[PDB]
Amino acid sequence: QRECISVHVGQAGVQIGNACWELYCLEHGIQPDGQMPSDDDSFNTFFSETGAGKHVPRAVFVDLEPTVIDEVRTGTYRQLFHPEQLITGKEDAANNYARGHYTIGKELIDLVLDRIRKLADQCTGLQGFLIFHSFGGGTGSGFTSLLMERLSVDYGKKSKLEFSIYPAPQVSTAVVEPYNSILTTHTTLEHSDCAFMVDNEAIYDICRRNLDIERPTYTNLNRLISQIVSSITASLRFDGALNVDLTEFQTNLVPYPRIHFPLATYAPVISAEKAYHEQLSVAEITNACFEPANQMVKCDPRHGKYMACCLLYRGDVVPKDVNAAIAAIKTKRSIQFVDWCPTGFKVGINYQPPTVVPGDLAKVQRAVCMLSNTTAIAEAWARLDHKFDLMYAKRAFVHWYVGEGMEEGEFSEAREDMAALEKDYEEVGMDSVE
Amino acid sequence: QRECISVHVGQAGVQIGNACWELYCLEHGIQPDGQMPSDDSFNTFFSETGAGKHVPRAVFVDLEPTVIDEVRTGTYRQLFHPEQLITGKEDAANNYARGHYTIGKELIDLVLDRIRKLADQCTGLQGFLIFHSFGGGTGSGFTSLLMERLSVDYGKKSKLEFSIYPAPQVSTAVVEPYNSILTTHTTLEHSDCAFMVDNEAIYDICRRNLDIERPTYTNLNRLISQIVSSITASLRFDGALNVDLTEFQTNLVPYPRIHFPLATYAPVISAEKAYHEQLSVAEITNACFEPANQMVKCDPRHGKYMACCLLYRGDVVPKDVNAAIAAIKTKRSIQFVDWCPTGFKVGINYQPPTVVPGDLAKVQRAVCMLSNTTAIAEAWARLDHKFDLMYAKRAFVHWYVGEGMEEGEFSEAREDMAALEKDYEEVGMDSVE
Amino acid sequence: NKNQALESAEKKRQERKQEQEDNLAEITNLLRGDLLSEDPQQAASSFGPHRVVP
Amino acid sequence: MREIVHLQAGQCGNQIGAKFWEVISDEHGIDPTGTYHGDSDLQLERINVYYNEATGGKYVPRAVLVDLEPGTMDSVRSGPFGQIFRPDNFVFGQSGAGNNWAKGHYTEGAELVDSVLDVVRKEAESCDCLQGFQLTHSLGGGTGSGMGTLLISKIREEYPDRIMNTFSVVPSPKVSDTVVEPYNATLSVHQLVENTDETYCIDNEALYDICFRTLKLTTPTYGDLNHLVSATMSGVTTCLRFPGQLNADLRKLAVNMVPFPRLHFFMPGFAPLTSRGSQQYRALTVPELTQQMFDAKNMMAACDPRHGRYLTVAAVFRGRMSMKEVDEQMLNVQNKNSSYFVEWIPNNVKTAVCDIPPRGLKMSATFIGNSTAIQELFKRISEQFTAMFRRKAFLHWYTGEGMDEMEFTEAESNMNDLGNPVVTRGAC
Amino acid sequence: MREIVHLQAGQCGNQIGAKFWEVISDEHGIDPTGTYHGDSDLQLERINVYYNEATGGKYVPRAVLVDLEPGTMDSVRSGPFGQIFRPDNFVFGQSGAGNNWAKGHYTEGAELVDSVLDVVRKEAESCDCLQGFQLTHSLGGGTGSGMGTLLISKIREEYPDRIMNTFSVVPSPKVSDTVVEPYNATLSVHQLVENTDETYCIDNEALYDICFRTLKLTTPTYGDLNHLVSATMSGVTTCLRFPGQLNADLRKLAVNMVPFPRLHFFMPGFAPLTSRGSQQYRALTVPELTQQMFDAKNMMAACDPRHGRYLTVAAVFRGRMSMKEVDEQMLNVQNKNSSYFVEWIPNNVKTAVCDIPPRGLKMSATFIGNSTAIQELFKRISEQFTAMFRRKAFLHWYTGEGMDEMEFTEAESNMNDLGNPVVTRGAC
Numbered sequence A: 001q002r003e004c005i006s007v008h009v010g011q012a013g014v015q016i017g018n019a020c021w022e023l024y025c026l027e028h029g030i031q032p033d034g035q036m037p038s039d040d041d042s043f044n045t046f047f048s049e050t051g052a053g054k055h056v057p058r059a060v061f062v063d064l065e066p067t068v069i070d071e072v073r074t075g076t077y078r079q080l081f082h083p084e085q086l087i088t089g090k091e092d093a094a095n096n097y098a099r100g101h102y103t104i105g106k107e108l109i110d111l112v113l114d115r116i117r118k119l120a121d122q123c124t125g126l127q128g129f130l131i132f133h134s135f136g137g138g139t140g141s142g143f144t145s146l147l148m149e150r151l152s153v154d155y156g157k158k159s160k161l162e163f164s165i166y167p168a169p170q171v172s173t174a175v176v177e178p179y180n181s182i183l184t185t186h187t188t189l190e191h192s193d194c195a196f197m198v199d200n201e202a203i204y205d206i207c208r209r210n211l212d213i214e215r216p217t218y219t220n221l222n223r224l225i226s227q228i229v230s231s232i233t234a235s236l237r238f239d240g241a242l243n244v245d246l247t248e249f250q251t252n253l254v255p256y257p258r259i260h261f262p263l264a265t266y267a268p269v270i271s272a273e274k275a276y277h278e279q280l281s282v283a284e285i286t287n288a289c290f291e292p293a294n295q296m297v298k299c300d301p302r303h304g305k306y307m308a309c310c311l312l313y314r315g316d317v318v319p320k321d322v323n324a325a326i327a328a329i330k331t332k333r334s335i336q337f338v339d340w341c342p343t344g345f346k347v348g349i350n351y352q353p354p355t356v357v358p359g360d361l362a363k364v365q366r367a368v369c370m371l372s373n374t375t376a377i378a379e380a381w382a383r384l385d386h387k388f389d390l391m392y393a394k395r396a397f398v399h400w401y402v403g404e405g406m407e408e409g410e411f412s413e414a415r416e417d418m419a420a421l422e423k424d425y426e427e428v429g430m431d432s433v434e
Numbered sequence B: 001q002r003e004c005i006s007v008h009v010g011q012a013g014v015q016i017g018n019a020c021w022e023l024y025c026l027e028h029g030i031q032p033d034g035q036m037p038s039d040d041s042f043n044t045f046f047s048e049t050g051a052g053k054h055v056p057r058a059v060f061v062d063l064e065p066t067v068i069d070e071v072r073t074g075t076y077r078q079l080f081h082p083e084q085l086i087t088g089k090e091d092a093a094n095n096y097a098r099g100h101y102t103i104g105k106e107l108i109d110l111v112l113d114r115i116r117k118l119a120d121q122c123t124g125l126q127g128f129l130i131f132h133s134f135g136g137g138t139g140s141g142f143t144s145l146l147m148e149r150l151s152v153d154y155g156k157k158s159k160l161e162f163s164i165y166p167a168p169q170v171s172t173a174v175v176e177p178y179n180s181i182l183t184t185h186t187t188l189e190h191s192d193c194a195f196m197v198d199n200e201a202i203y204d205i206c207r208r209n210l211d212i213e214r215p216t217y218t219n220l221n222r223l224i225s226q227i228v229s230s231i232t233a234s235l236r237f238d239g240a241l242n243v244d245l246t247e248f249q250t251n252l253v254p255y256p257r258i259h260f261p262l263a264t265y266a267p268v269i270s271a272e273k274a275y276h277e278q279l280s281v282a283e284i285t286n287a288c289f290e291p292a293n294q295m296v297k298c299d300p301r302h303g304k305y306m307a308c309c310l311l312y313r314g315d316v317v318p319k320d321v322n323a324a325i326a327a328i329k330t331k332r333s334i335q336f337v338d339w340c341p342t343g344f345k346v347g348i349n350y351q352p353p354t355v356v357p358g359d360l361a362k363v364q365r366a367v368c369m370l371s372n373t374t375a376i377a378e379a380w381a382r383l384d385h386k387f388d389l390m391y392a393k394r395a396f397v398h399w400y401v402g403e404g405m406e407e408g409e410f411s412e413a414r415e416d417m418a419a420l421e422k423d424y425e426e427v428g429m430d431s432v433e
Numbered sequence C: 001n002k003n004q005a006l007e008s009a010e011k012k013r014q015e016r017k018q019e020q021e022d023n024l025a026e027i028t029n030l031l032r033g034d035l036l037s038e039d040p041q042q043a044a045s046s047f048g049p050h051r052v053v054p
Numbered sequence D, E: 001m002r003e004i005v006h007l008q009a010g011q012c013g014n015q016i017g018a019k020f021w022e023v024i025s026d027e028h029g030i031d032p033t034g035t036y037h038g039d040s041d042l043q044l045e046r047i048n049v050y051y052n053e054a055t056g057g058k059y060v061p062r063a064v065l066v067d068l069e070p071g072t073m074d075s076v077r078s079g080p081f082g083q084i085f086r087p088d089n090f091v092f093g094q095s096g097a098g099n100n101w102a103k104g105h106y107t108e109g110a111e112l113v114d115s116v117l118d119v120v121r122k123e124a125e126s127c128d129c130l131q132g133f134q135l136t137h138s139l140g141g142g143t144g145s146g147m148g149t150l151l152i153s154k155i156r157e158e159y160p161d162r163i164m165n166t167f168s169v170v171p172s173p174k175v176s177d178t179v180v181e182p183y184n185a186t187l188s189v190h191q192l193v194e195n196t197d198e199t200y201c202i203d204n205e206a207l208y209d210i211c212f213r214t215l216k217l218t219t220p221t222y223g224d225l226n227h228l229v230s231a232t233m234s235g236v237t238t239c240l241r242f243p244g245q246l247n248a249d250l251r252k253l254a255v256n257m258v259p260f261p262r263l264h265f266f267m268p269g270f271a272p273l274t275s276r277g278s279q280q281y282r283a284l285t286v287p288e289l290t291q292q293m294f295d296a297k298n299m300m301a302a303c304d305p306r307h308g309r310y311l312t313v314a315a316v317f318r319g320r321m322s323m324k325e326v327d328e329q330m331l332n333v334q335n336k337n338s339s340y341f342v343e344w345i346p347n348n349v350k351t352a353v354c355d356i357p358p359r360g361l362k363m364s365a366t367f368i369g370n371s372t373a374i375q376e377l378f379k380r381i382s383e384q385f386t387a388m389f390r391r392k393a394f395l396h397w398y399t400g401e402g403m404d405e406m407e408f409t410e411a412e413s414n415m416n417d418l419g420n421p422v423v424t425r426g427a428c
């Protein structure tokens, strides 16, 4: 009835989907074998239902290189996924946007969109697509961008939401993130309807400080990202006082057509032997989101102003304690809003408590995921701007992309589009004088 | 009363017959011997010799003894009346000629004689289903002589043909091109409808859908059987919208010399891939139009559909058919010619596809589509290129003119098929007046 | 379908084992033959142990 | 039922035929004494292709043993499968060919050919539907060249619609067991052209190259060489003799490989051949068969296929195999090596598959190739002939036995004119 | 699935490859007979990157062993893991290179190049998605220089989109093994520039520095030196062959360590290296791995990276380990030493984390580094070539095998023209 398809691009996105679908199967009750245990529409939005109660995820796990799909189709959740939905090439993109977008994307895009339309045929009301990837690797940049292009020309009336692992401003994991992020953002700026960023150095910070895990892994990192996506796609899976939809997310988080870049944070990241000692009231959960330290993109919000915030409470939240707590957020001077958004909040309330996977996080009854479109992200974009300029001053790693089939002049307008984006991000910034 | 005499001609024809007859025997019950292990549905394919023996209504013909001599020594030695199996003591040697002018007009006599006996014991011949191979001596030559002679006797009676069109790339022969072009010429005014199925595509279907990385004729042959049992499923089982064997002609062959429908079975999935799909009327219908589950290597988007005949079977609710057919029309990719709006002969039988100890899985629904797309033009043109590629240096033609074929018949053939390529063009352009 | 899937998996396992046995049989029959053994008794003439087939 | 009558001429032809009858009797299950004792019932369905019935359940080969000297007499009788041939079909001559085409063609050879042809009648009208004759001989030397070509001409003018497969061992430049043999080969090619429908040229250089480089023998002998020949001799006519899918016999092979009546010369190959120490390293599959089939080390003619474009290729497979993978291997061979195949014959590879493999094996296959690269053989024999004919060397024997200088000139002219269309269709 | 074809050139290349296949069969669970005696499914899951299938479950390496003298290949076969390679990939020469680059590149090397190139098409065609080729050779001396660079040239010409990795043994600065090594090295670096995607320069002096000071052994052998070589060699290709997080294969290494096509000469390093006496006292952890790997003590090319700025650095870790320490330690070694990295490449280190460690150990890491300070080696071999070619040394043997006086000049000119940008990029 109200369903949206999940696409997971790259190794990052595939393990995203691993954590997300493990959480989804645990909270909806789905066994790892797919079958419901013995003892009706809640799963129907994210899970199909064939025959004798066999629930198959409405997802495609695309990567250009093996062994990360092979862990999925060998390990615990092998039977849950349809083996054709997991899509695998035979040669790695090797951290090239050019290889993700121009040469080895054509061998798999026809299969990927054939299975996308196979999933969409068994969809009465299709809400949109959830696109999980990173601004790093060649698959998750180039194949994601070509996916946005052909998805826009094929299913243009539907919504496209993006879960992008933004590159950290300090550490990174390779040397070609400055090229890859700018190159994919130039061609996905006009196609992605919404684009929530999540960093990884900031989840390192969160796991170190609030979670008491000195040695976190990717399990912890995008299991927290799994918790966030289960927080935002839950009002359509359950019942709530404010049933918020994926269609409403873009309308309440995207003021200008180019500015579709929110940041996500999650509240109670508290760690079991810290949670029996604290109330975790709704004031606590809405203050932890607006602290400049629990934001999971490493960019302090006080270097900028919030355009809009979508708060999604979950659990035993009182529908009027929430606005009695939002009042304090509005009255605090350190949190500064734009003068052209007198209303800057969207409230989404559902009665489903957070589901605790076996692991670190505590049994909590109150939670909130906060999604803010802020002017602070112009600083991190300027960091990527400076990095790309430093690399492209005397053509570092350029032969890799220009001998690939990609033209040399593509970097030029990829930089001019980025400069125009920065000019937009500063033009939205200053207060009104007219 | 709904009889269907079936003539299989050539390793291809005879071997597809093994598959077709297995499926027929394991559906009606007729055991391998010829007796139904302790009611009149078999009268469309088998008979009853007032004793309990159910003899097939068919004549398997192959000028080479090897093939047919394994059906007269296998686990069906009894079912087939000794005579029905008809052989000769010399092959045709991949030479259409030595199959239509020399070592071939020497067996037309006996075969027409047997076709007569099996046809005089029929109270309602629906038609003659002929299974051959566009490439090969008996498969081209004898089939040509047969189709012609049949016309002389059985006048305008249906003569549906099932065939293995020359593949677009594989092709296990250097002479295939010649035989295929000569066949169409002789059988372009004597064939009512000619269903087509290419091995290259069935190989692909038997890898992306059945997971048999190493297909063997037995696998491909059996898949073709499920199609024949669907084209002939409404004549022996009940349904909501039955389809006869004399309707495919008036609902798939649009203009005169344009009778080359392509085939596509929808639920061609494997056991460990059916535990994940609901295989519903909609799903399977969209699958038949998908440019991959096709079976005559030829992109349907490279052309325009002229007429379609979706023959369904199983738990198919008549209303889910209307739904799917409608949704297909909406989509653009599937472009139907303007001169044919109503372009879907829908038919629904009830018997859920029979599972033969083999590869395909136990499905409750199924759809076998028959499309007459103008994208078969590329096929005829690729084959045409090869005919010319060799007919220039008069290659491999001594073999054909040293049996009885005047060398000019190759020219008359190329000319006839050029008209066919041009025909497939005129019946595709849309009137803008 | 499950019974069919397990039967097909068992059929593939049995076919692989049969193919390996056939491979080892082929290796043994060509190792023990005459072309790939250079037996001095190939020249055992039917005219007696004093002559050889030339 | 289709029959093949097997003719053997010369010492080379007689020994190749003896090894061939040994290996085909091993395949069908006939012991040395002639009776059948095997395991499969599929070895008796098509035993009447090489074996005639006798009383007491005794199978007798349909071979005509011919030589002009009674020593191959003693050799093929002293062979292990000696007491299996008819003594009446076992014709011999009280003479010697003497490495002389004149003494094989215009002498005592033409006197013995009457009895040879009479035996051919005795074994040829004792059939109901005969497919052809299969003559094994050597082009270099006497008997197999002289008697061979004379018997070829007589049987071709007697039965004109039956297929004559000649397995011809052709002289080599590296090692020569006869000084005169360019003369014999030059005279023999002229009758080989306008007569036989399928000629298999086999060279002793390439036979030893397979015996030494590939099989890695220590002391390869004539028996091993003849076994390499007889593997393809049995594998060509195997869909006529055992069942399968896409059964291809001699006529179907000739139709699919001879585009023009003079271009019937081939290059055989057989490719489950591995060394003793490298046989346990095998990964034996259809790609491995196609691999060892299509390289320029398994050819049994001394003609490298990289020096000329393949006109046609036929591969006759044996065993339980997948038609998709066989067709794919042939397709990828054609697509990857595109310069080595002519472009006026698209899909110039024929596939045949027999189900029953040879005994002691699981999966075998044979190569036949009509190639441009057999230019080299006929040219090198032509320059050797012109070198020996410019000074009239070794010619008094031929002229005294009844030849003519115009006859030698016409033989060389016809052989050079066989060298011409293999040039012009390789050059399109 | 991806594939790698392994090539060995020279005596040094054959010994390095022998120890490499020893530790790879050790890593996967392959006994010297060849069949699998292992303890995990993941070892057999991706065994198809180095090992072809064969009958009986007998995995065979795709290694082509090349030498112009058949003396050390017999020792390789008589070694512990000797009866594991194909006898057909075992290509040798009936001559001697004699440590002469002209005799390796313009003589009998160019006669045996055909046999090696046929073998490597067999090993590339027995594939469907090849990733590339992996040559091990000694830069100094013959065969591995001359034949090796010729083989690299033909392979790179025929396969244009496959990664070529070349583990090259460069002569020591302090000691010297075959007096014409600057001739061989300067003549072969010219092809190594214009041909290879990745070159891993290794040095025996640095190997001995590790074996005497870091390993603190007394009597080390070339077995142990090639053990270190193959330790980093197997460490490079571990995400290709085992699962993990941030999988990085050879093309990823190429992309993230060559900024410009000239500077593909890397310096490897393997660093869980601790003696028998100090292994008890070690406190194995990720910061210790990073400091032992980035120290200018475990460097395996004898050029101190303190004298130059790092262009790009790649670290491939191995074992169960938390990502936060790996990222934090790489950021910390970028921050603490700021002048040792270039300023125009921010975050100039790549991280890879493979899941399965080498056994016997808990946690390991391998290093690749495109340091500017590799110019010390190239200036040293350049001055060795100039000061020796000025008086026309050893040169009649180079010009009599088919060179000319010009042929050395553009080799030294190209070597100086690579010396130039690895001054400009080191000085911004």
Ligand SMILES: Nc1nc2c(ncn2[C@@H]2O[C@H](COP(=O)(O)OP(=O)(O)OP(=O)(O)O)[C@@H](O)[C@H]2O)c(=O)[nH]1
Pocket (backbone or CB within 6 Å): A009, A010, A011, A012, A013, A015, A016, A065, A092, A093, A094, A095, A096, A133, A134, A135, A136, A137, A138, A139, A140, A141, A165, A172, A173, A200, A218, A219, A221, A222, A223, E245, E246, E247, E248, E252
């Ligand atoms: N939870 C979790 N996060 C990951 C994982 N892998 C990567 N990430 C994040 O994703 C970023 C980039 O990795 P990718 O974009 O996936 O690289 P790729 O798409 O596989 O591209 P290739 O390197 O060519 O294979 C890293 O910097 C990580 O921060 C993972 O396995 N699990």
Ligand SMILES: Nc1nc2c(ncn2[C@@H]2O[C@H](COP(=O)(O)OP(=O)(O)OP(=O)(O)O)[C@@H](O)[C@H]2O)c(=O)[nH]1
Pocket (backbone or CB within 6 Å): B009, B010, B011, B012, B013, B015, B016, B064, B091, B092, B093, B094, B095, B132, B133, B134, B135, B136, B137, B138, B139, B140, B164, B171, B172, B173, B199, B217, B220, B221, D245, D246, D247, D248, D252
């Ligand atoms: N399904 C199926 N197709 C076949 C079979 N045999 C052949 N074909 C196809 O038919 C084509 C030619 O085979 P045939 O027409 O049967 O050959 P033939 O009629 O026996 O004539 P000859 O080749 O002379 O023996 C091949 O290219 C195959 O694609 C078969 O046994 N089963």
Ligand SMILES: Nc1nc2c(ncn2[C@@H]2O[C@H](COP(=O)(O)OP(=O)(O)O)[C@@H](O)[C@H]2O)c(=O)[nH]1
Pocket (backbone or CB within 6 Å): D009, D010, D011, D012, D013, D015, D016, D067, D097, D099, D138, D140, D141, D142, D143, D144, D145, D169, D176, D177, D178, D204, D222, D223, D225, D226, D229
């Ligand atoms: N394959 C094979 N070739 C042989 C054999 N014996 C001889 N030859 C070849 O036959 C050639 C000469 O035979 P030839 O003297 O003409 O025999 P003749 O016809 O009886 O005179 C020699 O050069 C041999 O290489 C054999 O047993 N097998």
Ligand SMILES: Nc1nc2c(ncn2[C@@H]2O[C@H](COP(=O)(O)OP(=O)(O)O)[C@@H](O)[C@H]2O)c(=O)[nH]1
Pocket (backbone or CB within 6 Å): E009, E010, E011, E012, E013, E015, E016, E067, E097, E099, E138, E140, E141, E142, E143, E144, E145, E169, E171, E177, E178, E204, E222, E223, E225, E226, E229
């Ligand atoms: N790592 C390693 N290096 C070796 C080994 N054997 C020789 N070398 C080096 O290889 C160089 C000489 O190799 P070379 O004689 O040119 O081998 P060739 O190519 O066969 O001529 C010497 O400088 C050695 O230091 C070994 O077993 N391991």
